[PDB]
Design a protein around this nucleic acid. Sequence first.
RNA 1: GUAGAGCACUGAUAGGGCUAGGGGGCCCACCAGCCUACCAAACCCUGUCAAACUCCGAAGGGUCCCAGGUGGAGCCUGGGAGUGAGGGCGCGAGCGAUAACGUCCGCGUCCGAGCGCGGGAACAACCGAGACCGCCAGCUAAGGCCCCCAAGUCUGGGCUAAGUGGUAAAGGAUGUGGCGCCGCGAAGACAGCCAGGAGGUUGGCUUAGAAGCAGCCAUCCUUUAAAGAGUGCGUAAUAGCUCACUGGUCGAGUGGCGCCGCGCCGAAAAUGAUGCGGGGCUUAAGCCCAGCGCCGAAGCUGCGGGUCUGGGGGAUGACCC
RNA 2: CGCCUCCUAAAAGGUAACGGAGGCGCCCAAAGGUCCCCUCAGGCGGGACGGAAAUCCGCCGGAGAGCGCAAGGGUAGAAGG
RNA 3: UCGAUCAACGGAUAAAAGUUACCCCGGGGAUAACAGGCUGAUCUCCCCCGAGCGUCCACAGCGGCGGGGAGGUUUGGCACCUCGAUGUCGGCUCGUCGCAUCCUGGGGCUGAAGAAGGUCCCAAGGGUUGGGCUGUUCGCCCAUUAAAGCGGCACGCGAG
RNA 4: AAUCCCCCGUGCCCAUAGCGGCGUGGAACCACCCGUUCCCAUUCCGAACACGGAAGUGAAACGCGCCAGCGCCGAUGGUACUGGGCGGGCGACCGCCUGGGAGAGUAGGUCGGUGCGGGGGAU
Lengths: 110, 180, 136
Amino acid sequence: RLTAYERRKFRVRNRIKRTGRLRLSVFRSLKHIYAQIIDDEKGVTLVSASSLALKLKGNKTEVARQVGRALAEKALALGIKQVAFDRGPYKYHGRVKALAEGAREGGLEF
Amino acid sequence: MEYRLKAYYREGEKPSALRRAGKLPGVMYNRHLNRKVYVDLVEFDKVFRQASIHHVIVLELPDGQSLPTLVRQVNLDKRRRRPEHVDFFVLSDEPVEMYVPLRFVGTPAGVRAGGVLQEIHRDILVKVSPRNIPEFIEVDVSGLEIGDSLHASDLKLPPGVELAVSPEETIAAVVPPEDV
Amino acid sequence: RMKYRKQQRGRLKGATKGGDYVAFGDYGLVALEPAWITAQQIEAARVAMVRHFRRGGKIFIRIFPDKPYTKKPLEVRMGKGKGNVEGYVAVVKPGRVMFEVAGVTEEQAMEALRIAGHKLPIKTKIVRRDAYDEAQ
RNA sequence: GUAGAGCACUGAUAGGGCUAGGGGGCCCACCAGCCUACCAAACCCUGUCAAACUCCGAAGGGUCCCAGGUGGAGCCUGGGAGUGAGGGCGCGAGCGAUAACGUCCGCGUCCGAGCGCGGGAACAACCGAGACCGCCAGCUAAGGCCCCCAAGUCUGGGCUAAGUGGUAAAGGAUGUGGCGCCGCGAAGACAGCCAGGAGGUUGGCUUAGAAGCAGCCAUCCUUUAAAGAGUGCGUAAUAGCUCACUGGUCGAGUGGCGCCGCGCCGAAAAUGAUGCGGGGCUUAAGCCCAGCGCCGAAGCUGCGGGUCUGGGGGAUGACCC
RNA sequence: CGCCUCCUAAAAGGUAACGGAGGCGCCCAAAGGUCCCCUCAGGCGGGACGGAAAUCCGCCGGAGAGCGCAAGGGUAGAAGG
RNA sequence: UCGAUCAACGGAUAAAAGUUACCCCGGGGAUAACAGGCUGAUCUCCCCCGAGCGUCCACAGCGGCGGGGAGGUUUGGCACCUCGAUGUCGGCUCGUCGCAUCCUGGGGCUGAAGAAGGUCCCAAGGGUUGGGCUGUUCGCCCAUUAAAGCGGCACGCGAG
RNA sequence: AAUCCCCCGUGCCCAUAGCGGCGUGGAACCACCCGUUCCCAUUCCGAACACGGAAGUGAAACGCGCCAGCGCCGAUGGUACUGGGCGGGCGACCGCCUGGGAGAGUAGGUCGGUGCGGGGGAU
């Protein structure tokens, strides 16, 4: 109970204290995956990442990197101009490393 | 049988005055509909006293609305006895909370036995029985010694069945005078 | 007496009221105007009763050897750490539910108490079961 | 977060149901049996405690802003300082023996340091009350009014009668009076009365005797005054006795346990005696509830004066509010 | 006869007592940083050298094990591994 | 930035123990010792209950266990009178009150025959010896005696 | 575009968002799932974390709805307490006036209500 749930509530509360204003919530797994943006629980939630517009379920952590960069610019302008970070159900090397670089260009803008 | 005289005013000052005349506070209650009616002791008591009245409800007269009720609570008086507030519930039709008067006969093997006598622990039963419980729910045996004891299990349940109590836990047991 | 394997040395002093009442057999001895009562005196009653009752069928209990009373020194001059443990007993003050059985069936039990407490140490009263009691 | 409170946190602990640990031992090599004899982690139920346990939780106290908010304090700067040990009373914890006109701390008042008046006999701190100075003025506190001494030996309704007033507990009692209650078969009551106190009532042991009136229990029947499995004076059983019954006698109310308020026993002293004293017990008393009334403080009002302080007219005064 | 902790300070805070209790006058070179992971004792049931109690499997659990050192606070949404 | 139980820890110095019945100067009953005071520890006396002894009989004689007061003695608690002053013991001499009265009597009770004891309530009236040893009052011992009490008053007495 | 509805996330409210019992969905969710050279990973195993994808299934994690047995919530009354003023008692202590007035103790109460992004569910 408290165990895995905590895996969760932990990345949670820590992430939370963190405060540079916004955080995107990526989400691991295939069709599962998708990342939405949030700030202070003001109540609001900027823009939504990638509606399952499938591009290559293949060996594509790139299906990923793509949906990512996508969301990257999506928000980039979606919501004028800002800076912060996000969640992640894991380290940045696969699926998540991916949403990362996606965001990465999102800000990089080149 | 029962009845009473109500309290328009209630809480403290009033119940106290009551006491003063010889009246103790009374709660008339029925499934979430509540009214403070007040207690004329003397009689009140004779009544209560019946005790058969406390175990197996009775009818009360208030205004003129003859209704069915029992005590579900009572504040009987610290510094002595008598009370501080008498509590009754009038029933609709599903009486589950029943501490029906219980009698059992431990026909000899007890004190005429090894001196040992029988200790009555339960003597009554808080089981279930909607608008249907006798003035006497009962059971029996013929052993009261060795290191003998019996309870809610052995029990032996009659008509309006339903054990809201527990899988046995000591209706009674026998202890020695200076042993057996 | 019995207040065995305590835990501390001593209490303090006050008194005023508590929570003794019920019944527990129908042979009852209830205090009324006391305070602490010697675990001993206590045993006294215990005896009194026990013996009277054709000397067998058990009585029950009531209060306990509760606290540790200290007259400290022996008779010195005062300033000890107030140390010294010495007399252990009950702390019952508002007419308390003191419960004693046996199977006397009568004013026989009566007597038993009569003396037990007449003895013991205070203004007190006795009876039986008078207004049951419902728990959860 | 103490009082309370509750028990699930920990620790107690009392009667209980289930349970193992020793079990007492040895079959004492495969060494497995009853017992429950077991200590019960326990067990739930029945149970009550804890300043240094608490799942609940106040009674106030703490404090920030808005508002009351002038007595008159409130603030900051400043020179002249005295105590640096004190006690008493009430409440709350220590302690001490839950002793001391003890000593520890705290909230309050206190008393000194004003606390000089009343006062309770007289008594630094217990209830009343703040004295700037007058009055051969009147209203009042507390607490008082037979007298000693101001003030009704008021009225009204009770309850004690011991002198309680005029110090005391444990506890004892057909005290006194009061309940809120029990016996009334005028099928005329209880103590007083009359007579019978009935035949199987005749061992059960012991019968030396039970053949109720010698010890180990008997708990039945007939039978009428209604019936003593005989409550009692007793020896050798036995024999005789009062009603426990009328039965008749009488009849018309009787013997009670709980809860009450007012007294007595218990409670023996040292120069001599004592509610202050005289005194007083159906106003004179005293306890309780009722209502009226007058007394009595430097306390409060009315003739006036002194005095300082804010302001008021400041002419020097001054006067007045 | 210096300091920390708990009670009594009586609920703000805060106070004696020859009042209750009980510790410290070390260190930890890495219990000092941060990043990434993990996550108790104990109850039960099943198991090699066991064999009240290791080691492993299987469930259960306001977290009462835990944090050099005493208490108390905290606190595994870990300060804990 | 180092030396430091200065650990009686705010720490005078670096560097310190005693003893005075041989003693001596300052103030306070803001601290003892005498006694007094209040408390009563208490001890003494009394009062409840009865397990229980008294062959039989609870209580004639007795009380387990536990309990409840009186009094101011004994061993103590405190600090205000007292330290500009209160002589503490033992004894003497003259004693004065007190009763839980020892001898006295009046008594009910007996496990009272008589006699004699012993068991309580009433009542201080007078009375309530000599020596021994011990500074000791207490005490133990000799001889009687109706009897040869307990104690209040700084444990009366130094202006005797 | 901007209606409620199915939801996948992801937010305030601390146990009526709990345990557990019966059910039930994958079409689309999403989970387990397949396999592992490649990111990157287990002091053992890609167990987890992870990479690498058709499938198979919906067992398992899983979301609503019915079920209150345990647990959680836990009023009306009612007493204790007591803030303050007065009495009654030598007494430890009792009681009277005026506001506040938990606990436990039958009620009866619940098996969450909702913040926002959104695949989208109903021209």
